[PDB]
Every structure is written in structure tokens, then in C-alpha cells.
């Protein structure tokens, strides 16, 4: 896989901001609050969120697009594992993952 260039990184920031602005992204914007989900961090061993990804983007943590996609997929995988399939939180992952794929393919 090809290294992420500085030109690549402008695109990644755009993709990330498109997701952060999505109406369904709210449960993913910041780390889960342990007060609203007291067992969350006993269940989910590798939490991830969009603020933690923004930090990594800004600090050029990602060297390959696959690593960026892997962090994003953890967000969605964590959500569907923690939540039952009829929860509104689960529905956020359904909507935002397919939005992400649309944007990812564009990033191309
Ligand atoms: C009850 N189920 C839930 C609850 C939450 C949650 C709760 C409070 C929160 N405060 C700041 C973020 C934040 C996220 N996130 C999910 S998630 C990431 O979609 O798996 N599922």
C-alpha cells in the first residue's frame, strides 16, 4: 500500500470532517462517557472515536490508508458489538459506515 502524502492528508481531514458533521455521528464524536455507559470499557477492549482519530490525523500518526480505515472500522465494530441491533446507537453505525464507504471510495 502507498504512503499517505501531504496531499493525501488534506483529503483525510476532509473525510473526517464529513463524518464529524453527519447527523448520525454524535455518539462517535468523543470517547464514550463512562458515566453514560458504566460497563462500556469492560466490554470494549480497543475503544476508538473520531476525536482520537482527528488527533492522530493532525499528528500524522497514519502512514498507510489501511491504518486509517482500520481505526474507523473499530468505531463501527465497537458500536454494533456493544449495542443490540434495534438500538438507535446501532443505527448510527449502519448509516455512518455506509456514508464512510461512499466518502472513502471518493478519496480513492
Ligand atoms: C448506550 N449506548 C451507547 C452510548 C454511547 C455514548 C454515551 C454517552 C456519551 N458521551 C459522550 C460520548 C458518548 C457515547 N455510545 C454508544 S456507541 C459509541 O454508539 O457504541 N452507545
From TrEMBL:
Domain Bromo: 20-90
Top-level taxon of the source organism: Eukaryota
Primary localization: nucleus
Full-length numbering of the shown residues: 309 to 416 of 420
Organism the protein comes from: Homo sapiens
One GO term of the biological process aspect: regulation of transcription by RNA polymerase II
Protein name: Bromodomain PHD finger transcription factor
Lineage, top ranks: Eukaryota, Metazoa, Chordata, Craniata, Vertebrata
GO cellular component, one term: NURF complex
Transmembrane segments: none
Intracellular or extracellular location(s): Nucleus
Entry keyword set: Bromodomain, Metal-binding, Nucleus, Zinc, Zinc-finger
GO MF annotations in UniProt: zinc ion binding
Keyword Zinc: yes
Gene: BPTF
Amino acid at each position: 500500500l502507498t504512503p499517505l502524502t501531504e496531499k493525501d492528508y488534506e483529503g483525510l481531514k476532509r473525510v473526517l470532517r464529513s463524518l464529524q458533521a453527519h447527523k448520525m455521528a454524535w455518539p462517535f464524536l468523543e470517547p464514550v462517557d463512562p458515566n453514560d455507559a458504566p460497563d462500556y470499557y469492560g466490554v470494549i477492549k480497543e475503544p476508538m472515536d473520531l476525536a482520537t482519530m482527528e488527533e492522530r490525523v493532525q499528528r500524522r500518526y497514519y502512514e498507510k490508508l489501511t491504518e486509517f480505515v482500520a481505526d474507523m472500522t473499530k468505531i463501527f465494530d465497537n458500536c454494533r458489538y456493544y449495542n443490540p441491533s434495534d438500538s438507535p446507537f446501532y443505527q448510527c453505525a449502519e448509516v455512518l459506515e455506509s456514508f464512510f464507504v461512499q466518502k472513502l471510495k471518493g478519496f480513492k
